[PDB]
């Protein structure tokens, strides 16, 4: 599924995601439309290192799910990645505050660095209702 923004921004509100472990609401925003363009599907084979990074929050199978093909890997958040390409975020969700949980915290992903980190992150947002 590509959710529309202001649809996904709800929903991320009722899943609990805004303020968790101090990390906004817009953050999560800008996370996830870098790293999928709000698409649940997506996947990315890294031909590097043998992993592949899933849905929505494109999470990596070395870390946080398990698909079986990727060497030394452990899974974090004890889910197949399977179930990482569901319309539906719940299972996602779950991951994701397992992976803020660590210290890194929101800075685990590049892609926030690089796009989303000391930026007026406000846009992802606006107008939305939440």
Same mark, same amino acid.
């Given at each position: 599924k590509v959710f529309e923004r202001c649809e996904l921004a709800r929903t991320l509100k #009722? /899943?609990?995601m805004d303020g968790y472990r101090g990390i906004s609401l817009a953050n999560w925003m800008? /996370? !996830?439309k870098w790293e999928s363009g709000y698409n649940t599907r997506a996947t990315n084979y890294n031909a590097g290192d043998r992993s592949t990074d899933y849905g929505i929050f494109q999470m990596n199978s070395r870390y946080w799910c398990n698909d079986g093909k990727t060497p030394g890997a452990v899974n974090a958040c004890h889910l197949s990645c399977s179930a990482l390409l569901q319309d539906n975020i719940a299972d996602a969700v !779950? &991951?994701?505050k397992r992976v803020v949980r660590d210290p890194q915290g929101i800075r685990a992903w590049v892609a926030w660095r690089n #796009? &989303?980190?000391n930026r007026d992150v406000r846009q992802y947002v606006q107008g939305c209702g939440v």
């Open positions: #009722r /899943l609990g800008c /996370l !996830a !779950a &991951c994701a #796009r &989303c980190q």
